[PDB]
Amino acid sequence: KYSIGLAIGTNSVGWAVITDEYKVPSKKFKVLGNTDRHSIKKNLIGALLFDSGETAEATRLKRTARRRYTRRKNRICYLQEIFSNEMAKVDDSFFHRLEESFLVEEDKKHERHPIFGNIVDEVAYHEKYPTIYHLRKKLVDSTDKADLRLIYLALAHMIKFRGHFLIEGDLNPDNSDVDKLFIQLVQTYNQLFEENPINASGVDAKAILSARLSKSRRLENLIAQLPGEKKNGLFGNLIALSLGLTPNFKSNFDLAEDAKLQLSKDTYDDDLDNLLAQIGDQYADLFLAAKNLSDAILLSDILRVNTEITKAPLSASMIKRYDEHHQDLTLLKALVRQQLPEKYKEIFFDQSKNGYAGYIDGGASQEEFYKFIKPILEKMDGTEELLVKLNREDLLRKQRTFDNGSIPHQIHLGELHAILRRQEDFYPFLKDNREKIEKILTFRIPYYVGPLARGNSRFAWMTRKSEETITPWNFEEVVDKGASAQSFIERMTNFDKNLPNEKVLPKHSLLYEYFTVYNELTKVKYVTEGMRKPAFLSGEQKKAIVDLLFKTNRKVTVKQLKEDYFKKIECFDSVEISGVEDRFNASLGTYHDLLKIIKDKDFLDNEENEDILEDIVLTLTLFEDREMIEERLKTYAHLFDDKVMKQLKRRRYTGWGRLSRKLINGIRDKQSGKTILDFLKSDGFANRNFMQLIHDDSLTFKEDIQKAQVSGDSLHEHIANLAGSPAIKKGILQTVKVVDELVKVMGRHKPENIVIEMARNSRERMKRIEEGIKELGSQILKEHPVENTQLQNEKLYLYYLQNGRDMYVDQELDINRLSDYDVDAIVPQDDSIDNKVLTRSDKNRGKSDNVPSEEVVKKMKNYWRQLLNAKLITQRKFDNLTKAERGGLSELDKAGFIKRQLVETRQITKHVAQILDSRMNTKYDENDKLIREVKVITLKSKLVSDFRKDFQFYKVREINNYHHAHDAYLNAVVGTALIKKYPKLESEFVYGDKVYDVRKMAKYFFYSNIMNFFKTEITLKRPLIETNGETGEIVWDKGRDFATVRKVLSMPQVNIVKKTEVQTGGFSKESILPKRNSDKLIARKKDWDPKKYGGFDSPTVAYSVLVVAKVEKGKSKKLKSVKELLGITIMERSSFEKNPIDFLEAKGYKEVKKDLIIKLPKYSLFELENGRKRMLASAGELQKGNELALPSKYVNFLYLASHYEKLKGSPEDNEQKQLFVEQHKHYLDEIIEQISEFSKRVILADANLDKVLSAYNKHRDKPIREQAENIIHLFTLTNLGAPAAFKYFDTTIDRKRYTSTKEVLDATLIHQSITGLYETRIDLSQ
RNA sequence: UUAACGAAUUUAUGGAUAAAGUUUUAGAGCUAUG
DNA sequence: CAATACCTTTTATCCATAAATTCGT
DNA sequence: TTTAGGTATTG
RNA sequence: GUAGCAAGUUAAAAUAAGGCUAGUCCGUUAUCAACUUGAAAAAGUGGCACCGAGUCGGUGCUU
């Protein structure tokens, strides 16, 4: 006897309940707790507010670094382990001294100076190597033996910061002068070619080769410079090669098959010799010269500076940076003293300022310092040399900045290698471990491996050959690299939907292809002259045809079948095929790709070979890595000629299928003994399809299927599997929790109807007219100009696409009065530009029930075509405009019109329907078919949206939160209504498979716009009492039912519930905070008194706990009993739950009443005093609790007062809409007054209200549309939720926050249910 | 996901890396003047 | 106290898998 | 991308 | 301590406290009114009708 209407979003589930006659019911509810309120009445309408669900993404990102850091201290640790034994000879406590570098000297356990214990030698060190980058250049350049500590600092510093792995390959210090490298390339081609020598001449190889242009555009510029040679010529292919293009030398040598070579792709080292053996090995020397150039190009942008003197360009790059800063510092530092020496203290001494002193000592960014002194630079002479340095964005640069991520790790290795190479003569262990160290900088755990777990990671999948611990150096021997990469993909691969216990087969699987082929073929039927009736393909023909036609050719067309098989093999001269369209959809692409490679047709047909052929595709489809496939296939090498093997590694397959191996060939009917496949060929004269095979009660397949699936899943797994936003899933979980408690409410009775709905260019307008009057060539853009911000008004913008002439009358339109002109939809109500037109009168188009008439088209069938070529209209706009000459909107064209509009297309929402639909109908009748006890409906969001506008139930968001339920109410009404009149739409609108026929055009309705029947009076007659045509059920009364809808909207009591949530996540605000003598400073790691070292701050409060114990006071230390709110932080909560009391005593409580302790989750609910409500937003803060039920007349007024998007509706209706403003103009004083009684009652912020009251007084004479909108802001003051700031038109009003929580402790605590209806209240007394 | 195959973008889940930030210490502040 | 003002790590790169979405053949 | 809770200090 | 001036660009170390399963692992997502039951997963618990409407008020029958 009831129906539920849901309105789902990101932050709300809205829910209302409807009657046979569309009221919203009520009921008295029993109330628990020690309070005198023992029962209360509530309406059966509401919404459920919650904070949005959070993606795992941010979390997983924290995970990455968590991993990066525990692996970086690991890498530096490895270098120490190499050094430890040998460093100890030089310095006993060097490593210790660095470990404890961060400790204050009071806490230091060794000398304060790290590199060397003595004060004196540290001073010199920084004297001679101010930056590490200084030291690095020295360690690379000098031939002298350098101190081991110094050596260690260089290596570890490159190892701590490697730069990126975004190159695969290698790069050298020799490869910096591209010309020097270029000429060597030219030189080799010349020591090899005496008929066509080339000359280097005066080609600016350096400038041409390395520039921001395409890898292609640079290429053309090289060969342009030279004496004229073909980009296709050999030298161009080599120049091309370096540039990273794929160049094919086939045309040059006219080789039999094409062999291109790319230097980024893997196949380069292998391809070169495959080409090289035919060409001869002499030629090989050239290509390496060409690769070398590539490497010179590659780093040519990363270190643009000259690096000719040294083997350490990066550090050379830094050292030049450091000196320019020193140079430019003094030039600035002096020039400020020279002419403007008053500000110097502000710039260079005050840290807070964003001066240089701020730049270095303060936290100002390079960006902030540059901006701050650009004024000063251009107020003093000699600035310009300095300023061209600032506009360059290269001034007083730090060595280490955001920029450096650009550097490729390789360039660091070259400095480390060169450092190691230098000093290995002096220290033996370095020569031995040089290789072992280099792997540290070079090593990177490959992604397909995943984290190297020992079964203790959710995420990890890798596999190991030996259970021993993994170093960068033994990785290959312990880690099963390949079988890891299979596991890697296999976990993200789909399962088989029909039996989701077995993995999907590769889509290109040979078993898969056959199944996909035979299922299309079983349903093929042939009709011939001899036969009385059409007959299925029989068991032999499928088996013949496939051997005959599918093995011969990749794709099989129908004419191929009748001429190649039917006429040739059965000698039927004519036949007719019902079963398939113009060609067979399936194909055996692998058979042929496999047939052509192994070149053995016998090998493909022996069924004993199928187990071996599946594995080749599965390994072939799986693996990315050239090497890796081979380690797998080697088991098979014997079956095959070595040349056969070579082609197989090449073919790689992309994509995973739909179905399991087991389903197709493993499952077997206990009765028939035959598998799925074996029923797909040879089913006898009645030949069944795959769906039919699973859906045959007599066969074991439907029963065998059902067993795997139940073994189903709980709600979260059912809900979480859903595809879409992780947040809108939350509303779903809550939306279903909401229905289920609604069910509890109706005496455990189920509802008949359920209606669910979920909610979801400024310059684009300027460019589509710019180019559409450019190809029209018209001067209507020149005649009157407009701006880019203006065209969000339709009637202005539609004039411009039209060019000033009406598509219905062919005359020029006045610019000033578009008010008199109508916007016309090409098709009777679509609001897009595609279907909107502007003419003086919309009756010119013909009948208003008719498509734009033949009468107007004939004058302007040409104007609309002029507009299409100028992209001033679209194919959808035009094909609807001319549509009168295609018989107009056909009954079947009009069926496309409304049917497309109404049905929900979104795959998430659909799934929700199942979720509800399956959760309702548990009962099954004696037949297998389901009982549709409850009907689920999915409504588009627009349908209600226009109805509110059409039928005076206007929506304003920010006044209130009641509108959330109000859409749920309105969604239940429009829903139950559209299905009450038309069951023919039950199959379209409801998850229920019945079936609906398009043919009608059960006569129902002539007109194309669906939402008409509610209307008492409609724009060109309906009886006010509506009934279904076929059964006589009375469905809509235009007079009777409407009163209650406006009344229910108008209802002042709705259930608004904001879901209560223990706070999860990060412990505290992330920033490190400087040492302080505060007690709220959280220590970073144990031995660091934040007072000494700095610490954290601002912990997040997981939940509040109410305490009722005693405490010590004064030097007296007297015990007196306190009751208050304790803030359990996220860090604390783990510790708190183990022992509440011991933990409580440690925070200072004595004699806690253990039993009365209440954990108050966030958004917790209290009503105190006069029934104003407070939500606990923290242990120490509170949040607004009451929504102000603005009377319906004001909402409706304010929406029209707000004058949303000028006026969209019909213009005669608009004069009453404007009239309503003046008639209800005195309301503005009434609206403001509503707030005042409510603020004074609930908000208790009078401080603020006063600047408000003293502000509406001031702008009384300002217009209403402007005044009303600014009035709307205020409600955020009155709004449930957080104090946040709002502004009246000229004044910003700050928020009134509740920094004391005492008022709760003596109030009545409210626990409410998910609906809000069932409660337990608790009045608080110590 | 389509009446069927492909391509793309998006979002979701997952992996491997990078560069900045922040914090305490080390980078002997000197010269007049109590 | 309760106002008051102030605070709140970010920005890249590569690889995979999947739905869902809108194009194509 | 802006929220809305910490946090310390004032008249 | 106030005046004067020199100075500055780098480094090391930590990067959620930390946990045991000590792995070159894990540590911010989802999930949560209350009461009884449960290790948890979860299951259980709240008469109806009418008249009305400033955030639910009254009344009749059963209870």
Short mmCIF file of C-alpha atoms (C1' of nucleotides) in Angstrom, two decimals, chain C residues 1-8, chain D residues 3-8 10-11:
data_model
loop_
_atom_site.label_atom_id
_atom_site.label_comp_id
_atom_site.label_asym_id
_atom_site.label_seq_id
_atom_site.Cartn_x
_atom_site.Cartn_y
_atom_site.Cartn_z
"C1'" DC C 1 37.69 33.34 28.47
"C1'" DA C 2 35.48 34.43 23.89
"C1'" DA C 3 36.69 36.92 19.84
"C1'" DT C 4 40.62 37.45 16.18
"C1'" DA C 5 43.42 36.20 12.58
"C1'" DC C 6 46.14 32.76 10.85
"C1'" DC C 7 47.26 28.38 9.39
"C1'" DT C 8 46.67 24.19 6.19
"C1'" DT D 3 37.02 23.36 3.85
"C1'" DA D 4 36.60 24.09 8.17
"C1'" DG D 5 39.07 22.71 12.10
"C1'" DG D 6 43.93 24.11 15.21
"C1'" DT D 7 46.26 27.17 17.04
"C1'" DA D 8 48.22 31.36 19.52
"C1'" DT D 10 44.65 40.42 22.05
"C1'" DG D 11 42.37 44.02 24.19
#
